[PDB]
């Protein structure tokens, strides 16, 4: 009976959808709960402005979107279309995030 797109076509459509949009891609509550756990190891009983956490999220996603561009390039360099941990690790060594 059913319909089935070939593997990779829903993927490209998702690539097009999300590159033409600007909404935040990590859902709000899990991110805010992440942010407060990490903050707590540095300083306790901390309050946050909504905008502070909103900015923290804007930066993380922008950083991660960028890292996936660079990882992608590394993947393709080794004749793959799949990003693997070794690709992320190479992009950060070249960005000096590893030094």
């Amino acid at each position: 009976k059913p319909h089935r797109y070939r593997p990779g076509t829903v993927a490209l459509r998702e690539i097009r959808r999300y590159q033409k949009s600007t909404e935040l891609l990590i859902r709000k509550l899990p991110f805010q709960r992440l942010v407060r756990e990490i903050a707590q190891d540095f300083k306790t009983d901390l309050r946050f402005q909504s905008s502070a956490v909103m900015a923290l999220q804007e930066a993380c996603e922008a950083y991660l979107v960028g890292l996936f561009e660079d990882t992608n390039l590394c993947a393709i360099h080794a004749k793959r279309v799949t990003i693997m941990p070794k690709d992320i690790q190479l992009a950060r060594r070249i960005r000096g995030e590893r030094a």
């Binding site: 097009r16 590159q19 949009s21 600007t22 804007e58 922008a62 390039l73 279309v81």
Partner: protein
């Protein structure tokens, strides 16, 4: 004045306010009269150059609101502005649309 420092430099940007901001910014012991004039002009110019290209993004999208998306598109598609802001993030700006050729079907 009856006519202000901005207008006497033929500017929109605040010569007077930029002079104060320079003086209170721990930059140098003294600020010449010509410095905020010169700085306001450049800042007005770079602002003009951006809003120019960015309005064009909104003309294309047929909405006459410039939103952060239009600044981003505007900025990232201009090579010199891209270089100027290569380490900057436009919040709610997204990315330029681009898919690497190898990834396309056929």
């Amino acid at each position: 004045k009856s006519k202000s420092r901005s207008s006497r430099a033929g500017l929109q940007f605040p010569v007077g306010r930029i002079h104060r901001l320079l003086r209170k910014g721990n930059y140098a012991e003294r600020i010449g009269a010509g410095a905020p004039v010169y700085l306001a002009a450049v800042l007005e110019y770079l602002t003009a150059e951006i809003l120019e290209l960015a309005g064009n993004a909104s003309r294309d999208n047929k909405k006459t609101r410039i939103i952060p998306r239009h600044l981003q598109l505007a900025i990232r598609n201009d090579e010199e502005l891209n270089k100027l802001l290569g380490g900057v993030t436009i919040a709610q700006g997204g990315v330029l649309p681009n898919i690497q050729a190898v990834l396309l079907p056929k």
